[PDB]
Design a protein around this ligand. Structure first.
Ligand SMILES: Nc1nc2c(ncn2[C@@H]2O[C@H](COP(=O)(O)OP(=O)(O)O)[C@@H](O)[C@H]2O)c(=O)[nH]1
Ligand SMILES: [Mg+2]
Ligand SMILES: [Mg+2]
Length: 171
């Protein structure tokens, strides 16, 4: 009891909100500003749908990305809804995840990934639409959640989504 139950990796281009999301989720003491030059691994003890869970989240920032993928079970791929280039990278990153997980499996499934459209509080400046993010995720077989690390909006839903999916798979 109390041990790490799930290993999640953050992926996404710089500036999309990876660190901010993780610090928000884990209720870190300087929730608004904590951002060390060298990324940390973060922990959240929680109860997800009645089951006590302990998430270990790898914050990150090609070959090194492959190590991050081998050493984690679930994935949160973040893009910035105000930056279409970040959305394009996220799609590329999803393919890296699948291909890498395919290598090891010889199983991993796209539902163990969630695409996160962050900075949704910046609605008046979005370059990527909600329906567009939703349709990409549907095309790929993965989750899609819109979040605001700044306001905390939908942050838990985003992270817990991949745990929920993993459990859904067992039956
Ligand atoms: N308005 C807004 N700004 C955000 C949000 N998430 C992150 N930021 C800002 O985006 C910048 C980069 O955030 P950071 O967490 O360091 O991104 P990272 O490089 O992916 O880890 C910082 O100035 C954050 O304050 C959000 O949800 N809304
Ligand atoms: Mg960061
Ligand atoms: Mg550290």
């Amino acid at each position: 009891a109390g041990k790490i139950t799930d290993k999640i990796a953050m992926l996404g281009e710089g500036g999309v909100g990876k660190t901010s999301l993780t610090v928000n989720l884990t209720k870190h003491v300087f929730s608004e500003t904590y951002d060390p030059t060298l990324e940390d691994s973060y922990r959240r003890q929680c109860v997800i749908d009645g089951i006590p869970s302990h998430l270990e989240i790898l914050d990150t920032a090609g070959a090194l990305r492959e190590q991050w993928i081998r050493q984690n079970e679930l994935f949160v791929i973040v893009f910035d809804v105000t930056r279409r280039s970040s959305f394009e990278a996220a799609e590329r990153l999803f393919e890296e995840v699948i291909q890498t997980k395919r290598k090891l499996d010889e199983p991993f499934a796209p539902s163990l990934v969630v695409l996160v459209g962050n900075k949704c509080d910046l609605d008046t400046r979005r370059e990527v639409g909600t329906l567009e993010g939703s349709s990409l995720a549907k095309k790929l077989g993965c989750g899609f959640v819109e979040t605001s690390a700044k306001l905390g909006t939908n942050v838990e839903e985003a992270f817990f989504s991949v745990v929920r999916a993993d459990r859904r798979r067992k039956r």
